[model samples]
Target: HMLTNLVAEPFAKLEQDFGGSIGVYAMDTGSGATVSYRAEERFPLCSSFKGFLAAAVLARSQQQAGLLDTPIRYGKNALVPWSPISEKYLTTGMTVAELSAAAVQYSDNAAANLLLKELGGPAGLTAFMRSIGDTTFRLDRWELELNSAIPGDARDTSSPRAVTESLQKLTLGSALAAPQRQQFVDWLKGNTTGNHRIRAAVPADWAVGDKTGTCGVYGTANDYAVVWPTGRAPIVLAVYTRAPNKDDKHSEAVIAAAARLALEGLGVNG
Candidate 1:
């Protein structure tokens, strides 16, 4: 396929080294050249759904001016495994903006669930995605707790293409107003996670705004980002890796290599 040729050599190398399914979707805004590999297949999205949840909330905020200012309390009931908020700041209350920052910047599961609850639950997120013309993504459950048989119990899933498209829309002011879009990007820029993934292979001067996701059960690592070169249009890339063993370092390397190839293929500087 034309899409595969763009990064065929490096991507194949990534698959060989990583020993897992890898999906990538990259679009060069300046040149309009696109690349994809297994981009449509469903992959566990894990905490990455926080990006969508935050976007949905920001979009919903347009209808309700007080949405972002709405306050929520994090108590034991709100606790979930792997939540920093619950571990360090339990029983505290915060506004929607604070929760969103925690969810996106820190990947806090409790804060994410609180936001999901405010948005009317998993069904609401599903509806929100449909409203935005996204068909390859599904938010069927809250963070963690995937053992149940309920409707929202299914694992959250999305395609690389779907995530890249959503990020593009969010960054381009299509999903939110300019101010909100800027605020969203700011939150992503503050993300403290995934230092070794997409951002690892880029030049220090380049700007990368992204979200990272990991599925503990599935050993999946994913990242979607919008990269801005010093003098060129931004590029959007989404990379997902699911290995038999949960090797974060290996996943990070695979993603970094793929990102480097994508930048080179797009003729952007490292």
Candidate 2:
């Protein structure tokens, strides 16, 4: 009740501040306390899809060892705009594991496309989501290839509720083997993006594993996280915002505020 009571008015106003809609879903892993506001609303998942890609890679590796060692050549010509790999002084090829790391750590679009191709494209990712019993998320295009100016629907999308569910299953449930799970967790912990979102609002020393998404074309900003607090059950939170005409940093602040309220309401002083 505290969670809902705390966010009710604020979240409603957040929608207006965003100049569009918003979706929020937070859950206490130990108590099953849930707070949701438009949790089922679909929003574009920009780079947040890297989390899913990493899982897919891990799942494939389980079937065959050293799968991550497979090589994918992404020379300078393959570099996509808005990628850390492309911003480098010298562009070179990378292995599957290297590309995966780039995708997660820096939201590298070029590396993501290489990894996506290795996974067999959107069809393969869609099948993977279904195999995991995820019906609410979809991946339809490569990050750089997404033409947000086309004015239709999001190429890749998921509801805040579904994202939280995915994280819960990935971390707390039996969806992955022990080694695979550990690897995924390691990748998430190494994520270097969205430092000011949910992670910023939590306790300084707390363990918060998360991924972020941003699409300026559609004015979408999102974060999905599994926050671990000492002396309490972990919290799974997913926040999404869509402000089609603006590119300001306001959504990050909104997400941080929501995360703080959720933590405090759950009795986590951090």
Candidate 3:
């Protein structure tokens, strides 16, 4: 219950300090153990659901027996320049692997929509989430929204427990083959942001793959990370908050706190 206290107290503080609801969860993938504050409590996943999109792409490619290098068009809807994975980067045509990598590590919205499209749209991703044992998580639409909007297709989201469990399955070789799992993990590693929360807590020599999302507002800061440190086991962490707006540094600080707790519980005290 230490984790519960840690998250709950902070959530209260965030609400008092900013003004919003907060829910979070952290898991020890190595032991199938979970430490949550409000894990079962439902909340929007933000762009963290892109990891699911990543999995869907992997599953579809395997189903088709295709590789990431397979040539694909840079559809217009995915060409928004403001997004990290602008079609501008792939205007000449790019592979699935490249697109997926750009989506996960960077939390690129356009890349995520492209993934949603490739995985057979929102319905396909919804089916894939169920295939992986996620019932509460749903996506009747294919996009991720920064804030709630009327009939917004991108506002699609999920719960912390489901996301953590999904990542655990990938680590256990249930969702993807060992090689496929490694590919996704490696992509996560490459795309990881050292400037963020979970990444900041991990050692430079270790291996950590995770995705982070936020509404850029204080009360709704969310970060999710899964780690495979060199000398330790694997763990999953999801941090979410709903408060007023704080500078970006506040997220970095909170991520460091939660991720450090997850690492400690997993026996990676370093």
Candidate 4:
């Protein structure tokens, strides 16, 4: 409530004027630090959860290289009702690698669900989260980045601090193997979606790989990410907000502006 009035309202006003969320987070990639305004706050997980799903896929593939080449069929009914994947013109027998790309790049609901299923569904991701010692990033029980269909009892969950840490580990090549890490980077670089926030905030070549989440709209959003050039500082970051507009373009601009503000706050901008 305090955040809503003092911080959220002001930022929200900014977002409304700009057509985006009034939240952002920027950090030193090698340092695992943060530049944020109300960053510790929690919001919805929308498609941002796809990053974790992507990470989980990477973990699985590392454990089993064949998992990378594994074939997962995408039937028309397999995807979320409102996803960009429907426009991809793909077939049923796409490789796990291809699906991973679609899941991250296009933020495809069905493709993500398919990869989540191949990785063992919610149970698999939960197990993987536990394996990584991250009890907070559980997909089924907590608010997720995409297709947040978990029961109401399962809603209102959050993990900004935890997931940002997980992103750090993944970026450092300390959590997943070399092959898996590279794949994760490749997927993020090609992320056709969610770039408006973080990407718009930094130089085009800043080398950031991120995934974003929104509760139901971009107004209430979350972003977890990693930055390269590790020698500077840890680049892990998470930004959550409750913006009024859900439009990606609005959310994108708001997020980018907020990120720039946060980076400046932390003296991270060069």
Q: Show where candidate 4 strays beyond 4 Å.
A: 1-26, 29-33, 82-92, 141-157, 229-234, 243-250
Off by over 4 Å in 2: 1-6, 86-92, 147-154, 244-250
| Each prediction's number of clashing residue pairs | 1, 0, 7, 26
**Per-residue lDDT of candidate 1, residues 11-70 (tens digit):** 877777878778888898877888887788767787788888898888888889998888
Kindly list the per-residue Cα lDDT of model 2 for residues 151-254, writing each as its tens digit: 34746888899999988887767778888887777888888997988898888778888888877665577888888887788889898877656444436877
- Tell me the whole-model lDDT of each prediction, alpha carbons only: 0.79, 0.78, 0.65, 0.61
Best candidate (score: lDDT)? 1
Query: Tell me, what's the RMSD of every candidate?
Result: 3.1, 2.3, 3.7, 5.0
Instruction: Encode model 3's per-residue lDDT on 167-228: one tens digit a residue.
Output: 77775557887777887777777765545667888878777777776654343556776776
lDDT (C-alpha) at residue 145 in model 4: 44
Query: What lDDT does candidate 4 reach at residue 265?
Result: 52
lDDT of 1 at 94: 81
Task: Summarize candidate 4's per-residue lDDT along 140-225 as a digit string, tens digits.
Answer: 63223443323332343345666666666776647888877777877877776666776676665567777765556434665666
lDDT of residue 86 for candidate 1: 44
TM-score of each model, in listed order: 0.91, 0.91, 0.82, 0.77
Lowest summed lDDT window (length 10), candidate 3: 146-155
Tell me model 4's lDDT, rounded to 2 decimals: 0.61
Find the 10 residues in a row with the least total lDDT in model 1.
145-154
Q: If both were scored by TM-score, which would come out higher, candidate 1 or candidate 4?
A: 1
